[PDB]
Symmetry: D2
Subunit: 223 residues, 4 copies
């Protein structure tokens, strides 16, 4: 596009291959509490904040919301379990795509409702020189999280951008929904186990099978 | 069955009010230079007025509406809605309520509506059916559909567990709220959307109208 | 409707509760031949003639069509297995609905590509006085079968009817597709294990959960 | 990989001919008092001319077209199609073919088209790529897409099993034919339909264009 200034990347399943760990950790911590959240459902709910994920389960199974102390207790258990796995590595193609974006004079940004500190603290070491602190959105900015467009709208505000000056790179239907409802052109990369139809149904303007094929295709789609 | 209660949505289930709500949202947004189509208003059916306004601002302006903007637009919408000849009952709603009540079940209303003209007409339209203590309205909720909050609140007011209730809904966000509350949810497709959207939202059954639901009730509850 | 003259009923899963048997028999006969057709896939393919069902499997698994002698051999094995089960009983609500249709001066018809003779020979005993021989479509009329609209168009021709003078009652997505592509108002009854969305996606104008609820609702929908 | 061959559809994959086919079908049907929209012509992409004509007759007239009707309508459609400036290559098709050939794979064409002007331009557009003995056209088939017949015939002509080939298709009925042949099928969404329809038909991968497929080929074949 001719108007493009910024590329807004989600983190889990776009920059880091972290979803096998998040899905396993959510499934196991819920099971420890006698609550049912399958690994597949964890993928379906990918994009929600920790508080929202916990509340989905509490609301359907226990008929109430979690209290804040329950949210914090369960999230801390989930985070400990996530961190017990060998640390998540970069999605293949992410670094190469970021280099391309930057070389073209575009501003990369990260937009996530993650509170998984061990990942956030590794962004610079994994993608050196790509991201600016003042141009990032994390759990420490967000009140609602995806699928609310709030995090992407916050990224636009931080960047001094209009929606038509950005592209979102997302991999999960709730994350695509947030980008789309922010009015931003959204590219889905199907890096999980779900059908690509769910990404398109959520509003993705393009769909690719992987970050590496997006990288391979980037110059063509931006022409 | 351990069925004890039937939780009815109001707009498009008890009253034929959606042609009016969709028109009024479309028109008031148009007055403010914002594009909200009648079809889109149906897609948003279920949300509170404040949430509806915010979502349009988020997409079209890249920001949340201010509290002032929400109050002003909603005030205009309510005036316009009430300028139409008052909404009539959905055919079949009263017959179904008599059936439910005759079977010893407790009718409840669950809505994020704060439309006083409709809420204060419930008793006159469905005499003896509903009680303020057994209703959830805009005045009870923080989030509203599609959050299961209002249905969970109704369960609590009724002293119910989710497996003791059935929800009757007509809109995808409403079906989603009932389903995410863990409650068996029957969709009645009383609007212009494809029924697939109601099933996709988690409806356990789909009927084309309140009258066919009424006709079919004793069979499905066997 | 004010134009309605005829109601065109499918047989399997609408008049007879025969689909648990057809699906099991197809699955088992294919397994005997070292071919994969799941019970769920048998439901997905409900509506196809025997030759078509066999060819779906041969084409995807063996890279060719079945010969006619193979089709007849395998179909006869399937029919023997189907007939080894206690004979299929009426769908609850079918007889009551047919009585209603007839009392309203509508002409009931049967439209099926089934060659399962044991069911066809039982139609009169199960629904006495409802159907006319000259106003039926079976495997012995059809060249292609559902999802081709051919069988429903043949029913219209036999009945001296225009598409707008009939209603189809179907329960399977390929059968709904045939009715819809014949230009006929089609009511789906979800009497199997599939999602109702598949019936609606195929073109059904109404969807009910069972023959008994259709029966309960018939006078309302025809007003 | 035991990959040996790449089976290309023609219209909307090798040539940008679908704006012309859809317009010509729409117009010729209109001349005969039959409603076939341009969008519907895209939905039917893949079918042989005879099948396309029959389906419209079945829905609108309640009968099959006669052989005479099929021959007359098809004759008119072919004349109209060829009255447009001849269709150009899909960007990326030639580069992809060079890549495929360089990797030792056998290109094939699989189509129910009998459009001689396009079939007889294959060699001039893609020199050295294709051979008549390794093609399937309208002149080979009894049924055509979405029956897997044409893909199965291509496998046979190439001495292939289904696990030794990849199909490149752009239309839902074409994807369906490849998938029902048991062949890995890549959809390229080069028309106006939603990509969900291509995935619903059984595509294993979806790309937005022939050029992005070309760009991505070496990565997906790793
Ligand atoms: Ca993600
Ligand atoms: Ca949503
Ligand atoms: Ca999967
Ligand atoms: Ca789309
Ligand atoms: Ca409603
Ligand atoms: Ca509609
Ligand atoms: Ca369902
Ligand atoms: Ca059937
Ligand atoms: Ca079809
Ligand atoms: Ca099921
Ligand atoms: Ca429909
Ligand atoms: Ca094509
Ligand atoms: Ca389109
Ligand atoms: Ca798939
Ligand atoms: Mg949702
Ligand atoms: Mg098909």
């Amino acid at each position: 596009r001719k108007k493009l200034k910024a590329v807004l990347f989600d983190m889990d399943g776009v920059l880091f291959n972290s979803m096998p760990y998040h899905s396993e950790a959510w499934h196991q911590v819920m099971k420890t509490h006698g609550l049912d959240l399958s690994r597949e459902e964890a993928y379906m709910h990918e994009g929600r904040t920790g508080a929202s994920t916990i509340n989905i389960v509490f609301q359907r199974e226990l008929g109430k919301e979690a209290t804040q102390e329950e949210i914090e207790s369960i999230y801390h258990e989930k985070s400990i379990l996530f961190n017990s796995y060998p640390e998540a590595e970069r999605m293949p193609g992410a670094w190469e795509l970021l280099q391309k974006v930057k070389s073209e004079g575009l501003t990369p940004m990260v937009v996530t409702g993650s509170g998984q500190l061990s990942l956030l603290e590794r962004l610079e070491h994994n993608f050196p020189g790509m991201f600016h602190k003042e141009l990032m959105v994390t759990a420490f900015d967000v009140k609602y999280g995806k699928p609310n467009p709030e995090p992407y709208l916050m990224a636009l505000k931080k960047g001094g951008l209009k929606a038509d000056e950005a592209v979102v790179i997302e991999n999960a239907p709730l994350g695509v929904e947030a980008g789309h409802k922010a009015g931003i052109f959204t590219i889905a990369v199907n890096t999980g186990p779900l059908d690509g139809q769910v990404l398109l149904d959520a509003g993705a303007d393009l769909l690719f099978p992987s970050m590496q094929t997006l990288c391979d295709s980037w110059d063509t789609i931006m022409l």
